[PDB]
Write a structure and sequence with these properties.
elongated, FimA_N, structural molecule activity, mainly beta
Amino acid sequence: GNATISVVLKTSDDESKVAKLTVMVYNGEQQEAIKSAENATKVEDIKCSAGQRTLVVMANTGAMELVGKTLAEVKALTTELTAENQEATGLIMTAEPVDVTLVAGNNYYGYDGSQGGNQISQDTPLEIKRVHARMAFTEIKVQMSQSYVNKYNFAPENIYALVAKKESNLFGASLANSDDAYLTGSLTNFSGAYTPANYTHVDWLGRDYTEIGAATVNTPKGFYVLESTYAQNAGLRPTILCVKGKLTKHDGAPLSPEEMTAAFNAGWIVADNDPTTYYPVLVNFNSNNYTYDNGYTPKNKIERNHKYDIKLTITGPGTNNPENPITESAHLNVKCTVAEWVLVG
């Protein structure tokens, strides 16, 4: 113990906040020191020793055990999506391990130089980032095209996350990992093109949504999710944000039995006596009927630390299977605005 290191973080909807912060100091693979602080964006006066060391920084890790883990074990850590994540709790943040040289005495990472000692990354504090993303509606609007405007309307009931990847990694240039488990707020029996074999319903990936105007830029409605690469060997596995409700007559009255027969035969509603219909949006996906703001290019994946804000316009009937190929959802378009969170202090 002939050195100390102190580390300060870079600080500037429901933007990133640090509830707990842990700094680990590695001598090769072996953890030399670990120290945490609560409700702060720095950890200071960590006792260690001079030499080549690696700093690993994690925030909001809850009950995760970090003491004594090797560097390899820490870089292999995973997380699962949870109900509390949907309240923006437990939104883990990490920075990639960074290699430094500590000298005897006090060392500082990211400070302004006024402290003396050995200044590392002076005036360049450590940037940490969420591993989760958010997908949410900021508008749902019905604007039926000419063959549907005098026939149909839509009464919303719920919004859902479908084909949500259950776990991810926490470090690496891409966090999407080889586990094949997925979660949904809706049914596991759609047996569609996008339906994964390892699939579990969770109530907390659905929300009631009965007023069509509730979703706004100021009040987005959606879910937090983990990194997921859509192109898989078994088929496409896109993370989907979906609104579900009932297809109605244009003035809101219930469809007649003859109308429901036609709509069921067309694949739009669940049954000839069940006018339930779905409008799924493949998040961050490249499709002709999706546009992205300001020259952004969709990547066909969920990427960490991103907000995908979706304005959905319904222009005709939906589909009775939200895990059908996207081409079956022929009557909607999407305007998507993408942003990254920054840490606020």
